[PDB]
Amino acid sequence: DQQAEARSYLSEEMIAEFKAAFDMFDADGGGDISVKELGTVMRMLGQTPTKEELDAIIEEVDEDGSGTIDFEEFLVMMVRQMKEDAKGKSEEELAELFRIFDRNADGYIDAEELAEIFRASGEHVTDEEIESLMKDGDKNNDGRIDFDEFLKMMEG
Ligand SMILES: [Ca+2]
Ligand SMILES: [Ca+2]
Ligand SMILES: [Ca+2]
Ligand SMILES: [Ca+2]
Ligand SMILES: [Ca+2]
């Protein structure tokens, strides 16, 4: 089920990129990645994992209990890393967006700060538009916009 889902998330084109990586990691070309093969790749990345630590990573994926990671398990592993990064890059955009707007960085975006950003972006925006904006974001009605409110406004 997890592998089927993983598969559906990737394109032919992505799978083949991953078969290639998989094949490289698969040092003996046997079709599945062992604790030894994974360690070589991790050591390479500069880490010092113990055999138990490698065994653990494999368990994250190991749905047939072989103690090794085969291709179907590899994509699940890759897709999990792909979704985590996308999520992490998405959050970084939001944190920094809020940081650009909050020029006096008191942790809140006010109507003036809001205006300057659109101003700076090169777009028109009327005092009525900003007003509408500030009133739809101000959920606790204190006139300013906090990170909680901003997020709600962003992801909508
Ligand atoms: Ca295709
Ligand atoms: Ca192998
Ligand atoms: Ca397995
Ligand atoms: Ca501010
Ligand atoms: Ca508020």
Find the CATH number of the domain harbouring 59.
Answer: 1.10.238.10
Resolution in A: 1.9
**How far is ligand 1, taken at its centre, from the CA of residue 13, in Å?**
6
Instruction: Give dist(CA 52, CA 55) in Å, integer.
Output: 5
Give which of 70, 142, 81 is closest to 106, Cα–Cα: 142
Task: Return the ligand number nearest the Cα of 17.
Answer: 1
d(CA 136, CA 129): 11
Rounded CA-CA distance 153/58 in Å is 40
* Terminal alpha carbon distance of the chain: 31
- Measured distance CA(121)–CA(102) in Å, rounded: 15
**Ligand 4 centroid from CA 100, angstroms:** 10
Binding residues for Ca(2+): 26, 28, 32, 37, 62, 64, 66, 68, 73, 102, 104, 106, 108, 113, 138, 140, 142, 144, 149
Domain ranges, residue 78: 1-156
Domain count, the chain: 1
**116 alpha carbon, closest ligand:** 4
- Look-up of token digits 């990345």: 45
Q: Which residues contact 122 (CB under 8 A, 6 or more apart)?
A: none
- The experimental technique behind this entry is X-ray
98, 150 Cβ separation under 8 angstroms: yes
